[PDB]
Structure 1
Amino acid sequence: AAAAGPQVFDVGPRYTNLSYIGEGAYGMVCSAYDNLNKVRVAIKKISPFEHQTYCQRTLREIKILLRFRHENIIGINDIIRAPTIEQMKDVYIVQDLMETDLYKLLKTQHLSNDHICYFLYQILRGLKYIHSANVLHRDLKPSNLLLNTTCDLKICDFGLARVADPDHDHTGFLTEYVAARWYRAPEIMLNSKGYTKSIDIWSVGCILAEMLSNRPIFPGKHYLDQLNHILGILGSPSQEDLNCIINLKARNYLLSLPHKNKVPWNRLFPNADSKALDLLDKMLTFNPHKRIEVEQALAHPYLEQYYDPSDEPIAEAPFKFDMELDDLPKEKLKELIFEETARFQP
């Protein structure tokens, strides 16, 4: 069994010349030579079968990634697992080798306006497909956007993705939530379970702002300090936007806050393309119902060098019902993963 930072990384003979490229909360990621396609590739060792939570996110991500075929969404090339449920402890996901991600890029590289444009175009082109599948990503952030040496951008990490369910979105004030704090839409803290498409556009808008300045625009240290950062810049919600918040705890919190005027994007980003700041504004709308949708973003003048709706495909087979996973035992979930991975077995 090949070892890597000697654990087991048993991608047997087909995949060789392993090297560490990070880890996580499910397993470890490696580069590796594919002795069949003569090309380096990424491999994610996932060991989730101990905890029902890990099995859900793994089942979720594999189902979605197998259903999705799109240039700007990471593909699965292969899955390595034991031929039997009893022998299967780990699963290995084989994926196109991507040389970096937007997080790693933003810490060290200044982006030209052409790069920011093209990156944002590819993010929304990928998100248009995702949203057309009635899926919500719900964890869009720079580390979840992978790049190769020719700046092709692929969206990954569908662990927290749900089927859109806007009828059942409403919830109380300060409702708990799992996805990256800095990219969380204001309604998440206020009255939203994160079950409508507009939560992804908010995250994309945060990513645009980050690409313009190499800093996260809303670096809140905790849950309510996230809301303080957003209104620190958008200013106080209008009566109209408050009118939409019917839940009295959320409403009275927002009423309790001192008046703050809108801080206009040009003073935050004086070097930015004005068309970029215009699109940023529509993406970072306090009111989810007023927030630009993915197809309108793609049609924005900022993206006109790329905009081609004939070349921005939608999904053939959208998810038409929620994935009823929430309290299935981690034993049924291993079975479902076994079954979802069968097509890659010889």
Structure 2
Amino acid sequence: PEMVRGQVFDVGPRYTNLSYIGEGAYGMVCSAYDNVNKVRVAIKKISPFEHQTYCQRTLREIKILLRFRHENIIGINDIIRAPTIEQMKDVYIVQDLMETDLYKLLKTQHLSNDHICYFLYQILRGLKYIHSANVLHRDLKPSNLLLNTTCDLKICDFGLARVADPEYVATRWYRAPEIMLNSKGYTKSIDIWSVGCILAEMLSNRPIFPGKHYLDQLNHILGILGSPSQEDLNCIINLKARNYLLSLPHKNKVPWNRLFPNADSKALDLLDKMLTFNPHKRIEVEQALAHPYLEQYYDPSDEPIAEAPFKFDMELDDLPKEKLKELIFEETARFQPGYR
């Protein structure tokens, strides 16, 4: 097997000349030369089998990415794993090489309005497709927005995705208030909130709603949006949450133009509509694409949707890790030599 920085990366003979890129979640990521397609690709090593939660996320990501086909969503090109379930300990997922991500970019670069608009278009175009499949991504953040050298953007990491019907993360700053308040009845609107947080961060190079825990983040949200109105408070279906919010001192709205006065006024108008406290008043993906800020891109004939809504055969939340291993073995089989 080929070796990378201490660890087995057993992807030859098809994939060679490995180069460590970094860490994903359950393994390292390398770039490799694909000797069949004659191009460099990305390969992520996943080792999920000893943990039920890692297996659920791996199965979710594989099933969704194999079903989706869209320019602004990362694909799965190939999957390498052992020929028998007993020998399978690691799974290697092969994808288009994307040289950076919005998280890395924002670390060093102040983006022009032109690039902010172009990125925001691509994010919404991919998200239109995800939502049309009846899927919620639930974990949109800059590090999940991959970029190549010519500003093409692809959404990745569907480990936490769910089919819509009204979990540890390192990064909490893109989560909707209704999620942090434990409200009953989440929708696609949680993804629009995340995109709004991303747009704000493209405008300023720092998270707009940081905080050490959900209560600190809620304080940052209310410090900008202002205290919720009575009707928006009532949208929170959690009495303990409503009481907590009522316990806080009153805060006036800080207009977005005061925070980001360099920003395009149309960008701020759309930001305002994505970052509404009440999810029922939050702009939807199709309406966002149709917003004046995006007018130079907006093209419904060139913004495709899924052929039919996505459907999980089984609820995964309940399944033992051994059953999940069987499903991952089945799901990955199409890439095997001699598959039929």
Range of TM-score over shorter length:
over 0.9
Instruction: Kindly indicate whether residue 101 of structure 2 is the aligned counterpart of residue 110 of structure 1.
Output: no
How does the TM-score come out when normalised to structure 2? Answer: 0.94
Query: Structure 2: how far apart are the matches of 1:322 and 1:196?
Result: 21
Q: CA shift at 1:117, angstroms?
A: 0.4
Cα deviation digits, residues 256-311 of structure 1 (max 9, x gap)? 11111100011111110000000000000000000000000000000000001111
Alignment match, 1:86:
86
Of residues 178-187 and 153-162 in structure 1, the stretch that sits farther from structure 2 once superposed is: 178-187
Counterpart selection for 1:194 from 185, 191, 199: 185
Q: CA shift at 1:322, angstroms?
A: 7.5
Q: CA shift at 1:331, angstroms?
A: 1.2
Query: Structure 2: how far apart are the matches of 1:193 and 1:31?
Result: 42
Q: Secondary structure at the match of 1:146?
A: strand
8 Å CA contact 1:160–1:179 kept in 2: the answer is no
8 Å CA contact 2:135–2:310 kept in 1: the answer is yes
Q: Secondary structure at the match of 2:279?
A: coil
Unaligned residue ranges in structure 2 (runs of 5+): 1-6
Query: Structure 2: how far apart are the matches of 1:80 and 1:113?
Result: 41
Query: What is the correspondence of 1:1-346 to structure 2 with a 5 Å cutoff?
Result: 7-166=7-166, 178=169, 180-192=171-183, 195-320=186-311, 323-346=314-337
Sequence identity (%)? 99
Q: CA shift at 1:180, angstroms?
A: 2.9
Q: CA shift at 1:321, angstroms?
A: 5.5
Residues matched between the structures, number: 331
Per the alignment, do residues 180 and 322 of structure 1 end up closer, same or farther by CA in structure 2, a change over 3 Å counting? Answer: farther
Q: CA shift at 1:329, angstroms?
A: 1.4
Query: Structure 1: how far apart are the matches of 2:227 and 2:65?
Result: 40
Query: Structure 1: how far apart are the matches of 2:89 and 2:64?
Result: 22
Moved over 6 A (4+): none
Cα deviation digits, residues 176-226 of structure 1 (max 9, x gap)? 764731001111122336741010000000000000111111111112111
Of residues 184-193 and 114-123 in structure 1, the stretch that sits farther from structure 2 once superposed is: 184-193
8 Å CA contact 1:235–1:259 kept in 2: the answer is yes
Cα deviation digits, residues 137-167 of structure 1 (max 9, x gap)? 000000000000010000001011011111x
8 Å CA contact 1:136–1:195 kept in 2: the answer is no
Q: CA shift at 1:130, angstroms?
A: 0.3
8 Å CA contact 1:163–1:322 kept in 2: the answer is no
Q: CA shift at 1:327, angstroms?
A: 1.8
Per the alignment, do residues 47 and 321 of structure 1 end up closer, same or farther by CA in structure 2, a change over 3 Å counting? Answer: closer
Query: Structure 2: how far apart are the matches of 1:323 and 1:295?
Result: 30
Query: Structure 2: how far apart are the matches of 1:15 and 1:322?
Result: 33
Query: Structure 1: how far apart are the matches of 2:150 and 2:93?
Result: 23
How does the TM-score come out when normalised to structure 1? Answer: 0.93
Query: Structure 1: how far apart are the matches of 2:289 and 2:190?
Result: 17
Of residues 184-193 and 42-51 in structure 1, the stretch that sits farther from structure 2 once superposed is: 184-193
Cα deviation digits, residues 25-48 of structure 1 (max 9, x gap)? 311100111111111100000010
Query: Structure 1: how far apart are the matches of 2:238 and 2:30?
Result: 47
Query: Structure 2: how far apart are the matches of 1:136 and 1:111?
Result: 28
Q: Secondary structure at the match of 1:86?
A: helix
Query: Structure 1: how far apart are the matches of 2:227 and 2:127?
Result: 29
Of residues 214-223 and 66-75 in structure 1, the stretch that sits farther from structure 2 once superposed is: 214-223
